[PDB]
Design a protein around this nucleic acid. Structure first.
Lengths: 341, 546
RNA sequence: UUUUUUUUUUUUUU
RNA sequence: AGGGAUGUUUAGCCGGGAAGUUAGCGU
């Protein structure tokens, strides 16, 4: 009964008792502030010697760890507001957000983000907002992370972050929809990340999008489907476009992160070979006809044949992307073309 | 040194170049003290000693935050008759208030320089240009930064071709080249924009200042730089390699950077008022045996080079003879960070790719990523490490905090009885750091913990690692679909998901069971500084006006 | 002296 | 390593208003 009796009794009394206090005149109410400053016996005396209204309410909120007590805490909050004894601050917004979470009430948490700026000064902590995104993913509901992202983005108060853009992308590709439908929605968020201040996503962003891009329809259209497309132009065009976006982004990222027959691999210093994997893809054609349609990679793939890059005797990359290759795009691709041939 | 005599000789201390040294000293810094310091902070902000470097840091911790005060300080160093690299790096974590345009600290330098771009000499040009070298905001306030950087080049080009005696020396050419070279290589897209293309004699509010410079430059030149202006910059340097005093200039600089509006105070804590004053195959075995000799010697920064050198030589030698005719070192990792770590930096990254509690989390994310590309790396190290981490989490800080910071039973039956008893024993309900023993926290596989802040600090580090790892596992689950795969997915999903969600829970507890408000005895406060700030400002325009 | 402010002002020492 | 770090209670006089109070002869 240590977790049931001693827990409910302590919280019930604290709020009940507090209510009665307010009934007395203002002369018997708790001070707003902790204490007087130095301006108003050693300097350590005073300052922090009295219990504030705010401090008492937040102290009793540490007892909740169930859904039943979550409602109870709200009761106390209202009292302060109605009596004009609440001072919004950074701390206030932080604990409130977290209190819902600790009570196993994710539903209520989301509501806060759309109702904080109406009655509060400071926004919640960035950490908290990010953590709630993973909550939905663990339960298996990737469709509930689209509305939360938009509200944050639209809001001006909250500072824009590059990291925040990663979560969104990752969650959309896991939706339980068709291959073409899932990718189409993901591209919309990507696009949005290039207009408003031309944000630069991390280096490990373009890789993910590109992985599935040239695998879900491109690869599929030349393996079993053309047995003896409707957006073939867009798929190919977007493939290369993605790559381009990465180049521009990565170059500008290094300047602010840490204030840094024909070939061009003779006097090019020692760059990272990790990126050459995606750029080494051979362009077959726009259409099925690979011989009569299009007339415009070995030398590119000669840098790493045995799956051994110039890592041990080359340069060092900071916060690089996945080192691994394309199992579902390289291993099963070349073999088929050869073995079957 | 009591505050009484500190204010008397304040003037003299400034001259000596040692002002801030005694400020971060004895207690008792009241409004009286604060005001005095602030008085001189806006009258003649000129520093020569080490105070320049230590100015930004004091301000951060002080509380002073104004668009005017901040701006005036920076402009002092801008004007010209320790390294500069250090100063600019300090311009971080310093928000600016009372400004609807520029809110950060990095936008100050981009404005001052630009404004006075027309009052510079060639020797000093290189000085400012040296900011790209290593020893800003993540994404925001970045368009302004590169736009102003290109303006420097324009001036340089124009100024250099004026017809060289100082920078044309044998040693100056090399120095200049170092900086120039860093720019060239990846021309940002921002140069190829309509803003620079406007050579023919609504704009954003952030580029208000920048736009002004262009107009002036173009008019005094008799031109634009739309494309990646190169070659010419390098060709000129190739020929030399292949073959009242300072008082007047300040106020104009602030006036140009000044916005149309007077003061846009979006947020105001104190009450609204106004203050005033009255004054052939033999070599294969010769080098392959040198791979196990370093294991005993290395059981660090120099030892890693031995393994890399031997690994590449073992593979290359056999490669030639391959197409011509026709390791369990990870076990040692369980006794360096799982049984008491000591001085383990981020270097473990390189010692994982085939070569406190936070340290174990690092390895968890790396091992799972490599395996995503059955008994020797799943049930021996991957599953064994999770058992140790979970054991130290449920009964670690989670439970500890629930026994020390939570309300005790004593208080329940002492205070929480009747209403009248609440008005006398309310003092005992308070919780402080002093009242909390940190000893239990020091045995969590480590005194390294002094304050409450340290406890919280060691929470976000571990949750970050696991949070990232969960995404990798989820991606693989939805990728392998398009019966041996069932065993590698059913067991991996149920085990990985237990640690991702459970770890997050800890954060919630750790954030709520902490002291409320409270601060270290330093000096003034944000409330006091705000009133002082305005008084310090209005005071200046009383004395000098008569 | 304590809640309320669409009736105010003041704060420096060579 | 940025999912970091930093931030936390400002002081006195006078005039008017509401609730409680409505005990004082010590000047």
């Amino acid at each position: 009964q240590a977790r049931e009796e001693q827990r409910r009794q302590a919280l019930k009394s604290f709020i009940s008792r507090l209510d009665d206090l307010f009934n007395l005149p203002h002369q018997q109410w708790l001070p707003l502030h902790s204490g007087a400053p130095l301006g108003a016996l050693s300097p350590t005396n005073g300052r922090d010697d009295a219990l504030s209204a705010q401090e008492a309410f937040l102290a009793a909120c540490r007892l909740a760890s169930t859904r039943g007590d979550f409602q109870w805490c709200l009761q106390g909050l209202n009292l302060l507001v109605n009596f004009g004894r609440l001072r919004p601050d950074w701390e206030l917004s932080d604990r409130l957000m977290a209190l819902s979470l600790h009570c196993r009430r994710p539903e209520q948490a989301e509501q806060l983000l759309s109702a904080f700026p109406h009655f509060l000064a400071c926004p919640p902590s960035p950490v908290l907002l990010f953590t709630l995104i993973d909550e939905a993913l663990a339960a298996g509901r990737p469709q509930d992370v689209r509305r939360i992202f938009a509200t944050m983005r639209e809001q001006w108060q909250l500072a824009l972050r590059p990291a925040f853009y990663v979560a969104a992308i990752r969650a959309m590709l896991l939706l339980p929809t068709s291959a073409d439908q899932s990718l189409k929605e993901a591209q919309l968020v990507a696009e949005d990340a290039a207009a408003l201040g031309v944000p630069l996503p991390p280096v490990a962003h373009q890789l993910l999008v590109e992985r599935a891009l040239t695998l879900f329809e491109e690869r599929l259209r030349q393996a079993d489907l053309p047995g003896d497309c409707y957006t073939t132009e867009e798929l190919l065009n977007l493939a290369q476009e993605s790559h381009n976006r990465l180049l521009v982004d990565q170059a500008r990222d290094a300047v602010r992160r840490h204030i840094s027959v024909s070939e061009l691999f003779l006097w090019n210093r020692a760059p990272n070979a990790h990126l050459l994997a995606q750029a080494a893809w051979l362009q077959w054609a726009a259409e099925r006809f690979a011989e009569r349609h299009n007339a415009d990679w070995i030398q590119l793939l000669q840098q790493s044949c045995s799956a051994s890059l110039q890592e041990l005797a080359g340069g060092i990359d900071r916060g690089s992307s996945l080192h691994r290759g394309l199992p579902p795009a390289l291993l099963a691709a070349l073999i088929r073309s050869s073995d079957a041939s | 040194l009591s505050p009484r005599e500190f204010r008397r000789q304040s003037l003299k201390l400034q001259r000596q170049g040692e002002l801030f040294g005694y400020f971060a000293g004895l207690p008792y810094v009241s409004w009286r003290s604060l005001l005095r310091v602030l008085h001189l902070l806006v009258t003649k902000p000129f520093f020569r000693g080490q105070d320049l470097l230590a100015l930004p840091v004091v301000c951060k911790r002080l509380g002073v935050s104004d668009f005017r005060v901040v701006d005036r300080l920076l402009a002092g160093a801008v004007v010209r008759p320790p390294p500069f690299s250090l100063f600019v790096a300090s311009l971080d974590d310093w928000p600016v208030q009372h400004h609807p345009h520029h809110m950060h600290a990095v936008q100050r330098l981009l404005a001052a320089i630009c404004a006075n771009l027309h009052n510079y000499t060639t020797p000093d040009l290189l000085l400012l240009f040296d900011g790209l070298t290593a020893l800003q905001m993540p994404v925001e306030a970045l368009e302004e930064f590169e736009v102003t950087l290109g303006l420097l080049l324009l001036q340089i080009r124009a100024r250099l071709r004026e017809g060289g005696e100082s920078f044309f020396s044998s040693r100056n050419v090399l120095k200049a080249y170092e900086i120039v070279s860093r720019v060239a290589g990846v021309p940002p897209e921002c140069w190829t924009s309509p803003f620079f293309a406007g050579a023919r004699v609504p704009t954003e509010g952030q580029l208000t200042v920048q736009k002004h410079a262009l107009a002036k430059f173009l008019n005094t030149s008799p031109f634009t730089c739309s494309p990646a202006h190169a070659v010419e910059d390098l060709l000129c340097l190739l020929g030399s390699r292949i073959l009242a005093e300072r008082q007047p200039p300040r106020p104009t600089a602030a006036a140009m950077a000044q916005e149309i509006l007077k003061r846009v105070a979006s947020m105001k804590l104190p009450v609204e008022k106004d203050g005033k004053t009255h004054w052939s195959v033999v070599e294969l075995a010769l080098k392959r045996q040198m791979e196990r000799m370093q294991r005993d010697c290395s059981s660090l920064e120099s030892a890693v080079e031995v393994f890399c050198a031997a690994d590449v030589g073992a593979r290359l030698t056999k490669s030639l003879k391959s197409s011509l005719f026709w390791l369990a070192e990870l076990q040692l990792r369980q006794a360096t960070f799982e049984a008491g770590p000591l001085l383990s930096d981020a270097s473990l990254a390189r010692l994982t790719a085939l070569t406190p509690l936070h340290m174990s989390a690092l390895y968890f994310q790396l091992l799972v990523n490599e395996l995503a590309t059955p008994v020797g790396d799943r049930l021996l190290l991957h599953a064994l490490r999770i058992a140790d981490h979970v054991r130290q989490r449920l009964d670690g800080i989670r439970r500890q905090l629930a026994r020390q910071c939570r309300l005790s039973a004593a208080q329940q039956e002492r205070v929480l009885i009747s209403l009248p008893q609440f008005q006398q024993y309310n003092k005992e309900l308070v919780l402080r750091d002093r009242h909390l023993d940190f000893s239990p926290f020091g045995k969590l596989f480590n005194c390294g913990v002094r304050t409450s802040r340290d406890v919280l600090a060691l929470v976000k580090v571990t949750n970050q690692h696991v949070s990232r790892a969960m995404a990798s596992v989820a991606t693989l689950q939805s990728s392998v679909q398009l019966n041996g795969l069932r065993n590698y997915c059913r067991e991996l999903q149920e085990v990985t998901e237990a640690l991702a969600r459970s770890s997050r829970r800890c954060l919630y507890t750790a954030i709520v069971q902490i002291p409320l408000r409270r601060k270290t005895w330093v000096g003034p406060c944000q409330g006091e500084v705000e009133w002082a700030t305005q008084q310090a400002l209005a005071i200046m325009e009383a004395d000098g006006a008569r």
